[PDB]
Every structure is written in structure tokens, then in C-alpha cells.
Design a protein around this ligand. Sequence first.
Ligand code: V2K
Ligand code: V2K
Ligand code: CL
Ligand code: CL
Lengths: 227, 227, 9, 9
Amino acid sequence: MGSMERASLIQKAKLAEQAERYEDMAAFMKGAVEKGEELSCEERNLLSVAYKNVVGGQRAAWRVLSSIEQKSNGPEVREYREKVETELQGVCDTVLGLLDSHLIKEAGDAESRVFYLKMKGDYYRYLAEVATGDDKKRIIDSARSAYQEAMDISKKEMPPTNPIRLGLALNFSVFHYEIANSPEEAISLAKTTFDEAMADLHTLSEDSYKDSTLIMQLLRDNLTLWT
Amino acid sequence: MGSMERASLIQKAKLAEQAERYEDMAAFMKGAVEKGEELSCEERNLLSVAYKNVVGGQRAAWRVLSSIEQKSNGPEVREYREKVETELQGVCDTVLGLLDSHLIKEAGDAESRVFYLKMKGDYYRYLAEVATGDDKKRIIDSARSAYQEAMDISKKEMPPTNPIRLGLALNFSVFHYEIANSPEEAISLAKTTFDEAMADLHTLSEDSYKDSTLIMQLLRDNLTLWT
Amino acid sequence: AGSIPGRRS
Amino acid sequence: AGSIPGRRS
Ligand SMILES: *Cc1ccc(-n2c(C)nc3cc(OC)ccc32)cc1
Ligand SMILES: *Cc1ccc(-n2c(C)nc3cc(OC)ccc32)cc1
Ligand SMILES: [Cl-]
Ligand SMILES: [Cl-]
């Protein structure tokens, strides 16, 4: 996307979102990141929405194929699951590469740095979902390390109701439950996050209250499923 | 897909459908067609489902972008609508190319020949939806000619409740209403199709009755919207 | 109006 | 369970 203006890439990413063309949206946002400038809050959201939709479709397909393969146990189901898996890994590697070149290193404000480190944790988590064996171990540790650094910053620099802090805690709790085989840690983190947010709601405007309580309900939904 | 066995392509098309990977499904079915053998009834359905889902997503995106462009009247919305339009045209050209090389010419039984000529009408109709001017005229005539040949065969060779005959009539009626500016022809064709199917339902088994009445309800739904 | 959906088979 | 949906923005 080297020949397209940064502003045009951003505009087209917004159009692609409206048109539900998430692969295009991700390509436009990759082009925008590669212009080398930092991303604004809204631009970070466009980047994240684009890739979350792309990798979300790949994950759903991988789970369908992996289930068929497990029930079967010719080479075709395994071959096709492997094809989808390689594609998924390629998208995760692309996102991680953007974060490493050079979004995280230039992100100094807590809102940007936490956002990108949460993304890093999430895309290593998606890699861990399809990994096996010792490869799984290092990938799991990479996700954990990213989430932990984000958590440390968020607790020092953001109020307990901040939506990014809440979503980070939600996703790290899912990591503990689904990836790290630590359901007690998952439940403890979700509980403590919910309770500390509750106690801070009194400080919020109507609009912020709506955002924070929406995410707190997701924490509660997981707690209900886990307990 | 030249190095993959025909049977493996078909198997993977079925897996791609289950995984909702319609671009993959279409590529597998294109590979299967290019093996050069005729397609069975089920294989024809896989081909059609794959491309209808691909082009259906493109059409929906094109309509979103075209609406934004019309409300606006920088170059970005037009450029991006044009990009989606070119992609859509490319998929339609690919399907039409498979039909012309050499599915239609080898299709002798009414069920296969009508099926492929209906597809030809449909993909020219999708080209007509995005065409302008005199290009629109020849594309419209190509769709009409394909649908008409399919209609002529279907009326001679298939009972009025046959699902392919019914779906052909349904889609040709949509062509008349939405493309050819012939709403009266659309309504007449839908009515006559519905009534002649009604009168033939007594010949059908429970399972065939269910299929035929489902499509007849689609004809009725259009008649209700058009009258 | 509506053509045959044809997106499942 | 459920991570943040994050597919609309
Ligand atoms: C990772 C992540 C956290 C939080 C959101 N999110 C949601 C679901 N609603 C939000 C409203 C905001 O207004 C400030 C900010 C973030 C929000 C999405 C993804
Ligand atoms: C173009 C077209 C016509 C008809 C179908 N269709 C539907 C919607 N249900 C069907 C059941 C059948 O069993 C014999 C055959 C065709 C059917 C799809 C596309
Ligand atoms: Cl900075
Ligand atoms: Cl033949």
C-alpha cells in the first residue's frame, strides 16, 4: 500500500469495516502502520478490529476442521486443517510483526502501550491455541509476558473502570482458563477486576458508565460459566 | 489445483462449506471442474453454493459502497467501490468461463443443462447489476438468452414442481423485475410458475413436497412484495 | 426481490 | 469462555 496516502488508507479501512470486508480492512491498516507514524486511539481500534475479525474467522474454521479431524481419528481433513492453521499463523505473525516494528517501541502513553501489549498477548494466545508440545510452551510464555507487562502498566496508570484495562483483564483471564490451565487464577482475576471496577463506577459519566458496565458484564458472564 | 486429485478437491470443498470458507470452496470446485470430467448433481450444487456465497458477499459490499458513493455525490469511496466491483466482475467472469469451458457443451441431460444455463443467467445478471450504459445492454441480453434457453428446456423436460425449474423461474422473474425493468413480466412469470406447481404437488412424496413448497413460498414472497 | 438463496449445500 | 468480541469499531 506504499503508494496510497496514509489518510486514504484510514478512510478506506473505515469503508471496508462498513462493507464487512475485513481482509481489505486489515490490509489498509497494515499499510497505514507501515507509513511509520504512531496511531491515534481511533486508528488503533481500526487496526485491532480488522485483524480480530480476520483471525476470528480463521479460528472458527480451524475449530470446525480440528473437530472433524478428531472424530476421524484419507489425508484430506488433516491437510486442509493444516492449510487453515498455516494461514492463521501467518496473520498472527503479521500482526506481531507490526507490533514489533515499531508500534510498541514508540508507544509511551499508557493507553497506547497497554493497547498494543494486550494485542501482543492476544495474538500469541491465538498462536498457542493451535500449537503443540514445547513450541506451545514458549508461545504461552510470550503471551503471558505481554499480558503481564500490560497489566502492570494498567494498574499503575489507569482507573479500574478504564475499558482497555478491563478488556485486558478479561482476555488475560481467558488466557489463564483456556491456555494456561489455571482456572483458579482466571476466576480470581475476573472477580477482583469486576469488584474493583464496581467500586469506581461512581466516578463515571453516563456514557463511560455504559461502556464500563458492558465489559463488566462480560467478566460476570465468564464467572457464571466457570463457577 | 492441478496436482490435487479430483476426489480430494471435492472432499475439501465439502469441508470448506462446513467451515464457511467459501473462497476456498470455490477454488477447490474450480480445480475439480478443470479436471475435465462432467459434474454429478451433488458436485454441481457444491460449485454453485461456493460461487454464490463468494459473489453474494461481494454484491453486499458493492451495495454498501455504492450507497455511500451516491450519498457523497475525495476519490476514495469511488476508488474502493471500483476495486470491489472489479473483483466481483472477475469472479463472475471466472464462473462464466467454467460454464463455457466446457460444462455447458458437455451437459446433455435436462437437469445438468438447465442447471448450468440458470447459473449463466445468474452470473450475467450479477454483471448487469454493476454495469452501465450500452455495456449493460449486451450483458442484459446475455442473461436473458441464457435464462430463456433454460426455461425452454425446463418446460419441455421437467415437471412444474422440479426444484431447478422452480428456482430458474424465480431467478428469471427477479431478472425481469430488477434488471430488465419488466415488473409485469416478473409478476406474470411468478404467478404462472406458482400455480402450475400447485397443481402438480399431488404427485410428490413428502420429501419432494417439502422442497417444492419451500421454493413456491419464495415465489409467493416476491409476489407479495411486488403487488 | 429475493432470488433463491442457494448459499447452503 | 468469552474474550472481548472486538469485531466492531
Ligand atoms: C481490548 C478491548 C477493550 C475494550 C473494548 N471496548 C468495548 C467492548 N467498548 C469500549 C468502549 C470504549 O470507549 C472508551 C473503549 C473501549 C471499548 C474493546 C476492546
Ligand atoms: C437454483 C436452485 C434451485 C433450487 C434449489 N433448491 C432448494 C432451495 N432446495 C432444493 C432441494 C432439492 O432437492 C432435489 C433440489 C434443489 C433445491 C437451489 C438452487
Ligand atoms: Cl511515542
Ligand atoms: Cl454429457
